[PDB]
Amino acid sequence: KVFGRCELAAAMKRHGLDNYRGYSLGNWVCAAKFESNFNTQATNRNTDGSTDYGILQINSRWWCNDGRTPGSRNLCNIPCSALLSSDITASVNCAKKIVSDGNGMNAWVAWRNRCKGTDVQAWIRGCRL
Ligand SMILES: [Cl-]
Ligand SMILES: [Cl-]
Ligand SMILES: [Cl-]
Ligand SMILES: [Cl-]
Ligand SMILES: [Cl-]
Ligand SMILES: [Cl-]
Ligand SMILES: [Cl-]
Ligand code: NA
């Protein structure tokens, strides 16, 4: 599924991401825009052989099982395919664990490089939330 900007803001708020770990909804919408372009089916292979999955590009190195990332963990206790669903519940649940792990949203390098410190409220501007 390819979400619209306000459609995703609303789904993230329904699943309790808004202000989770003090990160306003615009931070989450901006991270999703640059990780996946709002596409739940986004996948990207990393040079180390891990793969990033879904709207928030969650990495198989630590967070989900894809069976092809040697020495990896599965700390969200999910198949990485669950992160590609039209329903974002598994991505949001896992994202809550990642953002709790100690470095906040810096875990998402695209958030650090493209969202952090910017006018992230623009991402929810106009949205009926
Ligand atoms: Cl957009
Ligand atoms: Cl915001
Ligand atoms: Cl594996
Ligand atoms: Cl594990
Ligand atoms: Cl699995
Ligand atoms: Cl959803
Ligand atoms: Cl933080
Ligand atoms: Na894994």
Give the resolution to one decimal, in Å: 1.5
Q: Tell me the ligand closest to 69's alpha carbon.
A: 3
Span from the CA of 105 to the centroid of ligand 7 (angstroms): 7
Structure tokens at 76: 């969200």
Please check whether residue 78 is in contact with residue 113, taking contact to mean a CB–CB distance below 8 angstroms. no
> CB-side exposure of 44: number of CA atoms within 13 Å?
16
Is there a binding annotation on residue 101?
A: yes
Torsion angle of C-alpha atoms 112, 31, 27, 6, degrees rounded to 10 = 160
Method underlying the structure: X-ray
The set of catalytic residues is 35, 52
- 33 phi/psi in degrees, rounded to 5: -55, -50
Own/partner contacts of 33-38, CB < 8 Å, gap of 24 or more, are 33/5, 33/123, 34/110, 34/111, 34/114, 34/115, 35/108, 35/110, 35/111, 37/2, 38/2, 38/3, 38/4, 38/5, 38/8
On the 0-12 / 13-18 / 19+ scale of CB atoms within 10 A, 109 is exposed
DSSP string, 73-111: --TT-SBGGGGGSSS-HHHHHHHHHHHTSSSGGGGSHHI
Ion ligand 4: residues, Cβ under 5 Å? 73-74
Name the E strands within 34-85: 43-45, 51-53, 58-59
Q: Where are the domains of the chain?
A: 5-124
Q: What does the radius of gyration of the chain's CA atoms come to, in whole angstroms?
A: 14
Helix axis angle, 25-36 to 5-14, nearest 10°: 120
Q: Coil, helix or strand for 72? A: coil
Span from the CA of 79 to the centroid of ligand 2 (angstroms): 30
Q: Tell me the ligand closest to 12's alpha carbon.
A: 6
- Look up the CATH architecture of domain 5-124: Orthogonal Bundle (1.10)
Q: Coil, helix or strand for 68? A: coil
- 82 phi/psi in degrees, rounded to 5: -60, -25
